[PDB]
Coordinates of C-alpha atoms in Angstrom, one line a residue:
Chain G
X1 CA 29.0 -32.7 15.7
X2 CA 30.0 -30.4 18.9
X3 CA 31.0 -27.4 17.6
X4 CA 33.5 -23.9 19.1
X5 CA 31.0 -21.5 18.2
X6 CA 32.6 -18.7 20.6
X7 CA 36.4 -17.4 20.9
X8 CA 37.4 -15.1 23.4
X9 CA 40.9 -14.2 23.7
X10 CA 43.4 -11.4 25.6
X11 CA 47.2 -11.8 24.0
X12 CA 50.3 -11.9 26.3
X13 CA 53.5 -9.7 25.4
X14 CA 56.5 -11.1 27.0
X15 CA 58.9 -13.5 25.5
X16 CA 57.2 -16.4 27.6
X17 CA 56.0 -19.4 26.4
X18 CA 52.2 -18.2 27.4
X19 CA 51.3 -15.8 24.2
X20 CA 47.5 -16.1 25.1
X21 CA 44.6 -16.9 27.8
X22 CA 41.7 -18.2 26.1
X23 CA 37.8 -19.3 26.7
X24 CA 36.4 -20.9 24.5
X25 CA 32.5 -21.9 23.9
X26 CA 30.9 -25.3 22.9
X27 CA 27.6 -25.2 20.9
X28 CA 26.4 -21.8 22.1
X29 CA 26.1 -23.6 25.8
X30 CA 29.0 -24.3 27.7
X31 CA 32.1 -22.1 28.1
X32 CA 35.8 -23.8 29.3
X33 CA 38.0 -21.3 30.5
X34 CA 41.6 -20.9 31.0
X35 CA 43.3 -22.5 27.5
X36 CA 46.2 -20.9 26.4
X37 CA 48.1 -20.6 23.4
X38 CA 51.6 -21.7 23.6
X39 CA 54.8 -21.1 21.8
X40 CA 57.6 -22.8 22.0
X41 CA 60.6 -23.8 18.6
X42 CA 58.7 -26.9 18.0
X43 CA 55.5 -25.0 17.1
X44 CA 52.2 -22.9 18.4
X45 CA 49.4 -24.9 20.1
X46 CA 46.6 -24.8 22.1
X47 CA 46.4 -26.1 25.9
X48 CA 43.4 -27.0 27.9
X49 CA 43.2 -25.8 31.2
X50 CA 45.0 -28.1 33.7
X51 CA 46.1 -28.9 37.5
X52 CA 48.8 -30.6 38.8
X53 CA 47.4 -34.4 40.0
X54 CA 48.9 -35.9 43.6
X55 CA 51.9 -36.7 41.6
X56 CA 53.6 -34.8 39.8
X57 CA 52.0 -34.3 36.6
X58 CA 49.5 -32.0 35.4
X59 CA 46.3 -33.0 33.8
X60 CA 43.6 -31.4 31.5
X61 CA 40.5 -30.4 33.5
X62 CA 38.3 -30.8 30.6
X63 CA 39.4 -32.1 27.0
X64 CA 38.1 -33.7 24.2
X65 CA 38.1 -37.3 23.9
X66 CA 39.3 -37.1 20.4
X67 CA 41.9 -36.0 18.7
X68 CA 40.8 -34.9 16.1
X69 CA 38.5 -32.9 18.0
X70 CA 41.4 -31.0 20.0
X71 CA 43.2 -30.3 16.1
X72 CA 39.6 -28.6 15.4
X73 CA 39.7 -26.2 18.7
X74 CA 43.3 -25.7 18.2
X75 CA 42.6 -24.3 14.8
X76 CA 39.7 -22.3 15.9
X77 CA 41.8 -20.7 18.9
X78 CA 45.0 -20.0 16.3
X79 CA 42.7 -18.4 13.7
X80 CA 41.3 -16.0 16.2
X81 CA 44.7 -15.7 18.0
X82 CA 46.1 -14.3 14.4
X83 CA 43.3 -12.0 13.7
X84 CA 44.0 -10.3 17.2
X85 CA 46.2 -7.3 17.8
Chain P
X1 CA 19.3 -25.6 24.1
X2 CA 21.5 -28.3 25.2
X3 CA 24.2 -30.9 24.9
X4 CA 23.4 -33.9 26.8
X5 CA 25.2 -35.3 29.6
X6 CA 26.3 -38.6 27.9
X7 CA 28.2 -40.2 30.5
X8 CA 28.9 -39.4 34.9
X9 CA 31.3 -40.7 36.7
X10 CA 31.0 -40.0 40.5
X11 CA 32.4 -40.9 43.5
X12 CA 30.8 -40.1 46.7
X13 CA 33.0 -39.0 49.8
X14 CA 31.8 -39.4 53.4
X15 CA 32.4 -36.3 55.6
X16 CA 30.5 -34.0 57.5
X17 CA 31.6 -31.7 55.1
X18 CA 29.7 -29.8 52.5
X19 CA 31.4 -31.5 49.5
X20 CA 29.8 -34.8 48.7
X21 CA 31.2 -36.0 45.6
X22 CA 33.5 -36.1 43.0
X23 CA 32.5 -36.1 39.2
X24 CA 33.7 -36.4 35.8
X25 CA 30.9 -35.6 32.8
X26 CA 31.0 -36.1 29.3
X27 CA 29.2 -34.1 26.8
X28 CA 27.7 -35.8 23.2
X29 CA 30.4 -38.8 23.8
X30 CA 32.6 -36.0 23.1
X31 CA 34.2 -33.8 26.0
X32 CA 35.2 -34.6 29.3
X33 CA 35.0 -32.1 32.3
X34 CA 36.6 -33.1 35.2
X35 CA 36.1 -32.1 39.3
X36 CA 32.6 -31.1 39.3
X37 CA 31.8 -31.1 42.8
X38 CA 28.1 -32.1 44.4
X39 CA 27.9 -29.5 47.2
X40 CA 25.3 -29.3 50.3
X41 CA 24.3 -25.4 49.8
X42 CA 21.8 -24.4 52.2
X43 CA 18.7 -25.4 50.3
X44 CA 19.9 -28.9 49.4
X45 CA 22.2 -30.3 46.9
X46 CA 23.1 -29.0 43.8
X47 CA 26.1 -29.7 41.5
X48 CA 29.2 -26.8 41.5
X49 CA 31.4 -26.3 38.7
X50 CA 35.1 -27.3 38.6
X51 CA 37.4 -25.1 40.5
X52 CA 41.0 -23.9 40.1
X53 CA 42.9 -22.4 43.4
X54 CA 45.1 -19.4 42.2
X55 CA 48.3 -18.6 43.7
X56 CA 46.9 -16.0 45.8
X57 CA 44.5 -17.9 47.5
X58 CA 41.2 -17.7 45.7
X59 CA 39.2 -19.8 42.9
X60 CA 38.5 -19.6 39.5
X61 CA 35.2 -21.9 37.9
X62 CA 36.6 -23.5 34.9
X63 CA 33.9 -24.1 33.0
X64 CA 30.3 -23.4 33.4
X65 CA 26.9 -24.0 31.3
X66 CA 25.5 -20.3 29.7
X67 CA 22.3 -21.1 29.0
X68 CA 19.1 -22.6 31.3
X69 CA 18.6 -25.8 29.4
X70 CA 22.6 -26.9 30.3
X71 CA 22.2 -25.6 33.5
X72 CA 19.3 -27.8 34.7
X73 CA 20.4 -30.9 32.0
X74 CA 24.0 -30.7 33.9
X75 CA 22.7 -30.7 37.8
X76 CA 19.8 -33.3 36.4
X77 CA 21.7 -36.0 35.0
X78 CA 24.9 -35.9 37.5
X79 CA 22.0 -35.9 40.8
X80 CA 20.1 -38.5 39.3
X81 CA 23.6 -40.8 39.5
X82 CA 23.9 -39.2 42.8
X83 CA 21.3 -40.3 44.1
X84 CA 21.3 -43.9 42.6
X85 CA 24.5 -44.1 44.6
X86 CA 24.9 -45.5 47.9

């Protein structure tokens, strides 16, 4: 299974929601730039890079199609996102 | 080595523009990148990466392959539907 084998990440101090800009790295082969680690009273996540759509909204520009899958880079990202200063 | 392009979806945009299509990939049946763009460079066609416009009036590449087998297996399978495309 598709694995985060890289973390890169530079923390934000401000009391913003945005505590983090983030790349991340798939099996040693493809880097996705531009996550971010959130904060907000309902918890600490991870978000995918994304662009407002011709509504409107805004929309990952790459995600996984699982879950269970974003759970595991969420983790990843948070465990690196702790260990930094 | 790679992941393999699992899945392309493309649509083609008629322009004499250098932009030619749209496309969506999906890696292992597992990740989805959006707004890859299949560009007319000077030496033909080749596949660019998707492509944020900052605030300030330049781009950032949102995702790109980091090794030479991704490269080639990511411009490969997204011409090939390309060019099976009227």
């Amino acid at each position: 299974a598709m694995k985060v084998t890289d973390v890169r990440l530079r923390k934000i101090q401000t009391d913003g929601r945005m505590k983090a800009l983030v790349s991340i790295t798939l099996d040693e082969a493809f880097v996705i730039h531009d996550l971010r680690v959130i904060e907000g009273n309902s918890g600490l996540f991870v978000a995918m890079p994304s662009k407002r759509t011709p509504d409107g909204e805004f929309r990952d520009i790459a995600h996984p199609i699982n879950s269970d899958m974003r759970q595991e880079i969420q983790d990843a990202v948070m465990k690196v996102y702790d260990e930094t200063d």
